[PDB]
């Protein structure tokens, strides 16, 4: 059979946080240098930030996907993103 695998190992589909650790860390140190030069980033408490940012993003894509299906279209234009930004309140 070719379905039961997709039934017994697909009882648990989760998906994960993805933004790469080293590039993200380099980026945040880069935008932290100008705010305060020689800012030593503690290697802890950065996973919590790197989960919170992704959470807010996936909220933004779910809102823009709702807006997209509201426009009978699957692709994303800048209009959806900017109105999501404005209507959320920032």
């Amino acid at each position: 059979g070719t379905v039961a695998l997709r039934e017994i190992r697909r009882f648990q589909k989760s998906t994960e946080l993805l933004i790469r650790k080293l590039p993200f860390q380099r980026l945040v140190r880069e935008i932290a240098q100008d705010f305060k030069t020689d800012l030593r980033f503690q290697s802890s408490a950065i996973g919590a930030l790197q989960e919170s940012v992704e959470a807010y993003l996936v909220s933004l894509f779910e809102d823009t996907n709702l807006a997209a299906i509201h426009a009978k279209r699957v692709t994303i234009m800048p209009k959806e993103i900017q109105l999501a930004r404005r209507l959320r309140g920032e």
Binding site: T15, L18, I19, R20, P23, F24, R26, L27, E30, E54, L57, V58, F61, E62, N65, A68, R73, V74, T75, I76, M77, P78, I81
Partner: peptide, 28 residues
């Protein structure tokens, strides 16, 4: 000058996380 570090496939799988396989050319 490393803002471009976040790669395009990272954005594509970020969109894949939220559903809909449709992705534009400047959504990244």
């Amino acid at each position: 000058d490393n803002i471009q570090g976040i790669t395009k496939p990272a954005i594509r799988r970020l969109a894949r996380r939220g559903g809909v396989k449709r992705i534009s050319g400047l959504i990244y």
